[PDB]
Write a protein that binds this ligand. Structure first.
Ligand SMILES: [Cl-]
Ligand SMILES: [Cl-]
Length: 129
C-alpha cells in the first residue's frame, strides 16, 4: 500500500511512535518518505547481500529473517516479509526496538541525511491528528 502523508502520520501516532524515545512524529514520517516513498512493499538490496524491507526499510542483516542473508541476526524475530504488509504494526514494533538500540534514528541513513536537523514538523502540517 502507498500511504498518504497524513494517513501514515495518523497510523504512526496510533501505534505509539509520536515522541517515541523523544523523536516527534514528523521525524518518523520524514524517514518513511525518504526510505520508501510511503510504500509498504518497497525492497532494496544492499551490496553486502542484505535487503531492506518496507516503509522503514528495515535491514535483514540485523532485524528480520529473509532466508537469504547468511549470518543474519533476526533481532525483531519476524520474517522480513511481515514488514511489507499494509498493516504497519510489525514495522512499527521492530522500529521501536531499533531506535532503542543506542544510535537512535541515525540507524536510518535517509533520516540522518535528509531529515535530521530540518523542520520535520512540516511533515505533519495540515494533518488531522
Ligand atoms: Cl509501544
Ligand atoms: Cl536518541
Amino acid at each position: 500500500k502507498v500511504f498518504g502523508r497524513c494517513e501514515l502520520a495518523a497510523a504512526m501516532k496510533r501505534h505509539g511512535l509520536d515522541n517515541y524515545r523523544g523523536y516527534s512524529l514528523g521525524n518518523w514520517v520524514c524517514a518513511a518518505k525518504f526510505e520508501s516513498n510511503f510504500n509498504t512493499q518497497a525492497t532494496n538490496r544492499n551490496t553486502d547481500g542484505s535487503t531492506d524491507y518496507g516503509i522503514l526499510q528495515i535491514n535483514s542483516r540485523w532485524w528480520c529473517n529473509d532466508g537469504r542473508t547468511p549470518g543474519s541476526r533476526n533481532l525483531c524475530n519476524i520474517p522480513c516479509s511481515a514488514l511489507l504488509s499494509s498493516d504497519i504494526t510489525a514495522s512499527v514494533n521492530c522500529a521501536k526496538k531499533i531506535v532503542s538500540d543506542g544510535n537512535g534514528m541515525n540507524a536510518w541513513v535517509a533520516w540522518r541525511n535528509r531529515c535530521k536537523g530540518t523542520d520535520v514538523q512540516a511533515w505533519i502540517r495540515g494533518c488531522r491528528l
